[PDB]
Structures are given as C-alpha cells and as structure tokens.
C-alpha cells in the first residue's frame, strides 16, 4: 500500500472534537482539523490558524484569524467557526465530553452546570469583533489558557455541522492536514475495522504531510499487530504487546525507540460502588494503593517500560516532583493496607467481589491479573480481573455508568501541563471524572494554581493541591509510561512525540 499503515481503534464516540475525550477518536480528530495553535513533537505551540493570540494578563485575549483558510467543503474558516464550536462545547444541553476545557471563560457558568442564566446559550466572555477577530475574557487569570489553544476542544467547525451534528459526527468535515478518503471500495470509516485518510490539498499549515495518506487499522489484539509489524503488513505500532517486551529489541533493532511519555495508568473505583463511598471508601482506596507493588510490576510485567507513580500526573511534565510530602500513600505496605481496610470495615464490613474491568485490545491483561492477585493476597478478599473486548465498548459503559466494578483508566496528555492531568479528571463537573469524586477544596486549589503569574509558582501550587489527592485517593495512580514504538523497513522519519504518539504527518514511506 502507498499509505502509511498505523495502529488505532474504533472511536467510542462520533467524530466531533468537543465530543471526543479519548485517544482512539483523538488520533483521528487531530489529523482532520487545524486549530488556532498547533503543537510540535515536544508539545510546544505555534500559531497555526491564528494570525495572533494576544494577552498581557492571562485574562483578556485578542485572537485574530488568518484569512484564506477553508474547510474541505469549500466554506471559510472564520471567527464564528471558532466561537460557535466553543459555545457548542460549553453548553450543557449539548452534553459534550470536552465541556470542561471552556470552564475559565466568563459566561461558562451561565451555559454549563452552574448558578447563572439558564436561558443563555452562549458565553458572554466570547465576543466576535469582525469576521476574523474575536476576544475572550476569562473569569480569572489562567496560566495555561494560551497553551491549551492547540487542543481539539478548540477546533473550528463548518457552518453545516450545527444544522445536524449527528450527521457531522459520522462524516466530519475539517480544515486540517488530512481528510477522510473517498475510497474506491466502501466508506472511509469501516466501523470496528479501519479509517482511511488522505492529504487535504487545501491545507498549508505547520503540519503538512510528508506521506500520501494514513490508514488506522483497528486491531482486536496487539499480538496480531506486532506480528503484522514484523512481516511488514503494519508500518508503525505505537504499543508493543507485553509478550514482546523482552524481544522487541532483538526483533526490531534500530527500528524501535523508547522513552518517557506523558501518559499514566490508574485503578478507578467509582464512589457509587458498594463499600467504596464516603470515609469508608477513602480508607479502602488508600488500602488498595498500599496493596499494589508498583516497582515489582513495572520490573516484571512491563520489563521496565513503566515507572511507578509518585503523584497523579506524569514524570515527564514541567514542574513534576517525585518527592512530594505525603506521597508515601503510593508505597507498597501490606501491613498498612490491612490496617486501612480494617478501619473501613469498622464503618461497614466488606463483602462481595472486587473486580477490575479492562479493555483486552490494548495489552492490559498481565498487569490487571497481577494487581488483582496482589489485592487478593494482601487483603484477603475476592479480587479478580474482568476483561471486555474493545476500548469503545468499555468506555461506553464507563461513560453511561453501566459499569458495575472497578476499572483501569489513564490519561495521555493533550498538552504539557500538570493542571491538564488533574482538572479534567478530578474536578467536580468534569466529563472525564469517571468515579464521581467531588472535593471543592481541591477545585479551588487548582484555580489558585491557574492564577499564579509565573510557571514556577503555578507548579508549586499544583503540587500543594496534590496533597488533597494523596489524602482522598480519588483514583489509585499506578505508573507512567516509557513508550516503545516500532516501525517497518518501508517507512522512515518516525518521531515519537512527548505524549507517546507517532508524529503522523512527518512519517515518510518509499
């Protein structure tokens, strides 16, 4: 094939930027759209669709849009294309999973779940000035507002989207480096099989493709994907299966690269489950954390390709500190785990089964089995693994709250900001808060970190806020990632970005 073959998975949700909170949809959406900023392979933003983004105070922003941009339907990209998409994302009626990213904008409280004017459908802080200029007024200084403007939640949408957003989500129309193929034998998106993309000839931004297209192959099994990589039937595999972690170097040589990536893994136990709410639940989550031996699993299960968590973010992010006071809650300590679990039993004695659900399509079986066995042996409870076949179905059950057990989760960074690893997961109203954790003192601490005038102060305030997380253990942080990516002999110029993904636009195929 002339296009670059890479791994992916079926998106759990339609291809609407503000409706996409997961990496399977995200890796597609990021090929199809271009935002005000684009990110390079280290996560630094540069002006893309914006001609300028000006703020002297982290509160008031003036955004000018470059003229001449268009969507692949021929329609122009204007200030409205942004403002209408952002208002769509923010308005609670539209139930967009990325709503949280709009929270600092004045008027968000009117349109989101907050006290305010419930007839209002748009945010007062977002104001069109002319066809190619708009202003943003935030409720408070927000140190990572500029940085987040490369993120998918802020992508522009064509006017036609709003007339029928369900139709748009099945057949999205964007302005970015690729577009969906009009392939020769069936639809570009073959659900549960693959998505085909081709270069967008209209596009003249910072991410111009160096290849003739991309095919995301939705593997049911990472061993199948590794076999395909070794035979040349797959060009880039961004996740080596556990079975291959001790042999990929022999198999691939200089065609595999490893490095820290801003991705983590957690064990999530909804607060709505039996025995896992209130103070009882807090004590049991602390006990689970003490019942897991992260160095041992990282060494043996992952062959050193994960690093034990020391906080709720990821080692490679700016301001990370692996020696925060109170992080001893993330050390293995069986006697402590039993004491905490017994303290929980003083409130209500445990009964039943502790099951850890996971998506089997991404290589989690070995670690989940190991964690369940550790919990069983340390605490003396019936702890088991509970596999589901696909990420899409698994996330759907998490989102609609049908899931009836604990489950694995984890975050791949969208931009390199510790706050971005915390606010979307642990603030009270966030769409990716999968467990129902609510602590207004934590939300206020994050707001204080956002209001800091300098990055150094902000980082130290984020780390202060993480003390609340050490106390509440909203989820159990496990490890962060050492990404290992392999590629075939038919491609070159493969760079792995700061968050573990291939730099797709820059892959070359002879």
């Amino acid at each position: 094939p002339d296009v670059v073959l890479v791994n992916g998975g079926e998106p759990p949700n339609p291809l609407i930027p503000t409706g996409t909170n997961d990496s399977n949809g995200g890796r597609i959406i990021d090929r199809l759209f271009a935002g005000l900023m684009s990110y390079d392979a280290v996560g630094k933003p540069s002006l893309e669709v914006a001609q300028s983004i000006e703020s002297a105070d982290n509160v008031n922003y003036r955004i000018t849009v470059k003229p001449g941009w268009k969507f692949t339907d021929g329609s122009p990209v204007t200030a409205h294309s942004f403002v209408d998409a952002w208002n769509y994302g923010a308005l609670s009626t539209n139930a967009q999973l990325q709503q949280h990213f709009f929270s600092p904008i004045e008027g968000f409280d009117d349109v989101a779940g907050a006290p305010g004017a419930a007839s209002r459908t748009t945010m007062s802080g977002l104001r069109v000035v002319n066809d190619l200029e708009f202003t943003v007024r935030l409720k408070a200084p927000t140190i990572d507002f500029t940085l987040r403007l490369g993120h998918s939640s802020f992508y522009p949408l064509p006017d036609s989207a709003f007339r029928d957003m369900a139709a748009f989500g099945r057949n999205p129309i964007g302005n970015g480096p690729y577009k969906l193929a009009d392939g020769p034998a069936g639809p570009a998106w073959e659900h549960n099989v693959r998505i085909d993309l081709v270069p967008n000839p209209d596009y003249h931004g910072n991410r111009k493709p160096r290849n003739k297209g991309l095919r995301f192959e939705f593997y049911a099994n990472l061993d199948t994907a590794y076999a395909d990589l070794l035979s040349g039937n797959l060009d880039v595999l961004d996740t080596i299966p556990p079975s291959a972690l001790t042999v990929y170097q022999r198999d691939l040589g200089d065609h595999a690269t490893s490095g820290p990536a801003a991705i983590n893994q957690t064990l999530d136990t909804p607060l709505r489950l039996p025995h896992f709410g209130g103070e009882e639940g807090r004590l049991r989550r602390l006990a689970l954390s003490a019942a897991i031996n992260r160095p041992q699993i990282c060494q043996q299960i992952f062959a050193g390709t994960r690093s034990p968590a020391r906080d709720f973010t990821a080692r490679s992010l700016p301001g990370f500190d692996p020696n925060l006071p109170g992080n001893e809650v993330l050390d293995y300590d069986p006697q402590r785990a039993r004491r905490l679990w017994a303290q929980a039993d003083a409130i209500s004695p445990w009964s039943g089964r502790y099951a850890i659900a996971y998506n089997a399509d991404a290589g989690h079986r070995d670690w989940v089995d190991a964690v369940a066995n550790s919990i069983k042996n340390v605490l003396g409870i019936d702890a088991v693994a509970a596999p589901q076949p696909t990420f899409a179905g698994f996330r759907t059950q998490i989102t609609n709250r049908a899931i009836d057990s604990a489950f694995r989760a984890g975050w791949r960074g969208d931009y390199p900001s510790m706050i971005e690893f915390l606010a979307p997961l642990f603030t009270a109203g966030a769409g990716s808060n999968d467990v129902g954790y609510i602590n207004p003192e934590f939300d206020a601490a994050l707001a204080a970190a956002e209001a800091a005038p300098t990055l150094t102060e902000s980082h130290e305030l984020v780390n202060d806020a993480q003390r609340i997380l050490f106390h509440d253990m909203p989820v159990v942080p496990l490890w962060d990632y050492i990404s290992v990516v392999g590629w075939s002999s038919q491609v070159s110029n493969v760079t792995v970005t700061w968050n573990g993904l291939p730099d797709y636009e820059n892959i070359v195929k002879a």
Partner: peptide, 4 residues
Amino acid sequence: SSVT
C-alpha cells in the same frame, strides 16, 4: 485524553 483517556488512554487505550
């Protein structure tokens, strides 16, 4: 984004 949620991974996996």
